Write a protein that binds this ligand. Structure first.
Ligand SMILES: [K+]
Ligand SMILES: [K+]
Ligand SMILES: [K+]
Ligand SMILES: [Mg+2]
Ligand SMILES: [Mg+2]
Ligand SMILES: [Mg+2]
Ligand SMILES: [Mg+2]
Ligand SMILES: [Mg+2]
Ligand SMILES: [Mg+2]
Ligand SMILES: [Mg+2]
Ligand SMILES: [Mg+2]
Ligand SMILES: [Mg+2]
Ligand SMILES: [Mg+2]
Ligand SMILES: [Mg+2]
Ligand SMILES: [Mg+2]
Ligand SMILES: [Mg+2]
Ligand SMILES: [Mg+2]
Ligand SMILES: [Mg+2]
Ligand SMILES: [Mg+2]
Lengths: 56, 94, 76, 135, 50
RNA sequence: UUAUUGGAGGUAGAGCACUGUUUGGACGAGGGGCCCCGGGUUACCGAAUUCAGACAAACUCCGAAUGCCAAUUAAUUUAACUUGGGAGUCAGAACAUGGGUGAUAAGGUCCGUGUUCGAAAGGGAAACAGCCCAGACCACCAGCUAAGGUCCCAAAAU
RNA sequence: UAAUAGCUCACUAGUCGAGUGACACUGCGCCGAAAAUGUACCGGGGCUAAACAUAUUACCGAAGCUGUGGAUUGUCCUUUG
RNA sequence: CUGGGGCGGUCGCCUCCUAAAAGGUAACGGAGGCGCUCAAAGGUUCCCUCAGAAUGGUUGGAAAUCAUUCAUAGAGUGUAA
RNA sequence: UUGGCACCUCGAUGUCGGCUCAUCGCAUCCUGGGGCUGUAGUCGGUCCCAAGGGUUGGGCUGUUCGCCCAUUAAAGCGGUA
RNA sequence: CUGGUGACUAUAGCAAGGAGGUCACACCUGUUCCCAUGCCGAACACAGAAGUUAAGCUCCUUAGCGUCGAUGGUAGUCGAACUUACGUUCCGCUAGAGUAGAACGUUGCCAGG
């Protein structure tokens, strides 16, 4: 289980990445979201890891 | 006709690049005996041994277990840079 | 100059993917010649289109290394 | 230096990024010339360089050019607004990427070879270096 | 019409560097070529006969 | 949207297995100029064969990553379609990338992809629509940071 | 020089009293470098670091985020908030 | 229509490439065809498998036709690719 | 310079030469300072520094250019819509 | 084991050498009627079994050609960070060629022994 913070904006980032952000549940910058460690969500990490900071 | 050797686990285009910058060449050893090993060897030692015992002389390779009798089936060499990039050691029959 | 023309494109290729459910008479793969052959419950039209004849499920397949085929298999 | 016949006289102009698909290891002769940089090379440059080497060396000597300009290139007529097709041919080019061997030379000593290929290097648009064979 | 656009002979620096009159001459060339179009039209309007 | 599975497709690369191009050799298949029916040649070599090295948008024995199409699957998300009322838009621009044209020129032109501008203010780039950071309901003599920076102009390390 | 001739270099021997060369890959830099109103491509002062590279710690810094209060429109709770 | 207009060229359809491995994708970007033909060159049933080279052989590239062997496709597929 | 682009200007940015008045650049025509010379000397060739000042009057042509007469230390190349 | 007949990407094939036969299959004897060849019983088809393993067929061995083919490394590349350099740096995938090597087929149903 882990929390996921959107530390870095989506202005200037493609719509793929923006979509993963919405799917994760991140809506503003420096917003956090707690989820489980599905590999389905590890892929959502890896698409946007440069936008994101994860903590466990 | 001797090379001391290290074994390498998995590698990337930064670990491998740092080795081959340091002057250590990657290689494999496969053939008649053991199954297969991925190794580091020293570029300078390898050069000296080949200038000594020929393009196809026989070599004793101290992988970390006992020495293995090998020869060079193929070498990937980098022109514009003048250094060896990968080596294939064919562990020969007896 | 002596050039500057080209014809309309014809929208060739696959039109229903593999592992997909398909009704009768459904186009699968428009083409020119047997780029892909038929298989089971598939017919080849005059212009070499490939159409299902029965409802079922699509599976593109092998027919010997330079030859594919396509089969619409029933389901239950 | 030209091809005798080609199917398409108006080609796209080639790619210049990357490195050699081949022609890197000196094969025929003893010494060679190796590009450190990328550019195009023409019939004209090749004739000049080859003349330079063959004059610097006596009749004792053997040269192997290792490139050929297959690819033509265009230039429009002068004082012409853009568009309206594609221009006629005015030359033929071999692309060169770093690594590739341009000239190889056999029948001499390394000093003579160095000076000849030095003289030739100044007649190409490319930085070169001098190569010997391998192991 | 082709002559209409090309510079004359022995026209020096100031006259050659003049560059404002290009449209004048281009329009004169269009006029003469329009006339060739008229004649070609007449030629087509001729009653062909075999 | 991702994970997984499957699938179509022939790109970058690479390669010469066909199509065309091409280097240097070994033979040659027999011609040609010239000498006297035949026989010669410091020569073209049309070719055939073969060894080695090379070229390709309209060559491919081969063949990626990506992207795409779906799934009796799982997770996260919150949109999608239909019917009707009402519109506006059909001059687009720069930047990055893949490519054409051009001169591997243009703040060039035309396409693909993406972002921004348009329609978007704020901080940096001296100033500077499109670059980088970032998306303003309002107030606050409160705080943490980004990009970018810390000698003075000019806030923060001489 | 007219050939001569003159004179040197190589090649060596003698003094010394420690280093001395030639090959290659690299980093940073040097000239190449001449334009028209006025220094005139660090923004300026000015800097031999106040530059460059590498590593680290602090900090400033937006109308971003947070804190506090207020308006509006929705959703969940909720009688009332 | 158009890298001003004009001349030149083009206007509809088909096939390649540009076209960036779905599809689609522009330019006065590059190469070519079409405005038909076939009562069989259609339908069906039976059977057959080519081109090219070497060799042998009259009128001789033995290229006409023949015989054999090789040859998996380089022939042919009415007609562009 | 001949060109490409077509970003500014279409509810107006007025052409060529000449006259008047200058100004900057230097890739220096002269004068100045030097190296080399295949510089004996006078004259020259060439190249480096140098932009302080100076740098002609007429004939033809609307002409700039150009040719010519006669001089001059020299009869400069260009930017400034 | 032989034969018939399907299935699998030639790992199955090509090539060379060798071997066997009246129980199969073959070649083989002839045109007798069915039937047939831009001409011939070569082929097709039929009445056959005197004859022969030569050939086709099948079996054994060999890795010369073909086919398949890792690991490792490389080119390339989605994405990200720097910068405009015919680019670099990090991650993930991942060739092609080749190298070692695999392989001179394996099964399924049926009739015979
Ligand atoms: K050069
Ligand atoms: K927007
Ligand atoms: K105007
Ligand atoms: Mg039809
Ligand atoms: Mg390619
Ligand atoms: Mg290609
Ligand atoms: Mg533009
Ligand atoms: Mg607008
Ligand atoms: Mg803004
Ligand atoms: Mg702070
Ligand atoms: Mg301060
Ligand atoms: Mg300090
Ligand atoms: Mg806010
Ligand atoms: Mg035009
Ligand atoms: Mg224009
Ligand atoms: Mg496509
Ligand atoms: Mg435009
Ligand atoms: Mg006004
Ligand atoms: Mg006067």
């Amino acid at each position: 289980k882990l929390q996921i913070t959107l530390t870095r904006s989506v202005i200037g980032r493609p719509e793929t990445q923006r979509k993963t952000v919405e799917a994760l549940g991140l809506k503003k910058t420096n917003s956090s979201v707690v989820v489980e460690d599905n590999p389905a969500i590890r892929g959502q990490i890896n698409k946007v890891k440069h936008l994101v900071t994860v903590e466990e | 006709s001797l090379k001391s050797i290290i074994r390498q686990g998995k590698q990337t285009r930064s670990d491998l690049k740092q080795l081959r910058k340091s002057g250590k060449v990657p290689a494999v050893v496969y053939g008649y005996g053991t199954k297969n090993v991925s190794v580091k060897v020293d570029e300078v030692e390898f050069i000296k041994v080949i200038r000594e015992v020929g393009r196809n002389g026989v070599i004793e390779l101290g992988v970390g277990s006992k020495t293995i009798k090998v020869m060079v089936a193929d070498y990937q060499f980098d022109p514009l840079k003048n250094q060896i990039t990968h080596i294939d050691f064919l562990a020969i029959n007896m | 100059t002596k050039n500057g023309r080209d014809s309309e494109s014809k929208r060739l290729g696959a039109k229903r993917a593999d592992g997909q459910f398909v009704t009768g008479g459904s186009i699968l793969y428009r083409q020119r010649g047997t780029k892909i052959y038929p298989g089971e419950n598939v017919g080849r039209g005059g212009d070499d289109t490939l159409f299902a004849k029965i409802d079922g499920v699509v599976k593109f397949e092998r027919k010997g290394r330079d030859k594919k085929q396509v089969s619409v298999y029933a389901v239950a | 230096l030209l091809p005798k016949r080609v199917k398409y006289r108006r080609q796209h102009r080639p790619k210049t990024t990357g490195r050699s698909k081949g022609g890197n290891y000196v094969t025929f002769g003893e010494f060679g010339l190796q590009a450190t940089t990328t550019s195009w090379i023409t019939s004209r440059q090749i004739e000049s360089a080859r003349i330079a080497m063959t004059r610097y060396m006596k009749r004792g000597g053997k040269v192997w050019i290792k490139i050929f300009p297959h690819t033509p290139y265009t230039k429009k007529p002068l004082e012409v607004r853009m568009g309206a097709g594609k221009g006629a041919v005015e030359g033929w080019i071999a692309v060169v990427k770093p690594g590739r061997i341009l000239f190889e030379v056999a029948g001499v000593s390394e000093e003579v070879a160095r000076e000849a290929l030095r003289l030739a290097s100044h007649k190409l648009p490319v930085k070169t270096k001098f190569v010997k064979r391998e192991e | 019409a082709q002559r209409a656009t090309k510079k004359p002979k022995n026209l020096s620096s100031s006259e050659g560097k003049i560059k404002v009159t290009k449209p004048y001459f281009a329009s004169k060339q269009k006029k003469l070529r329009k006339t060739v179009k008229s004649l070609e039209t007449r030629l087509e309007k001729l009653e062909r006969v075999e």
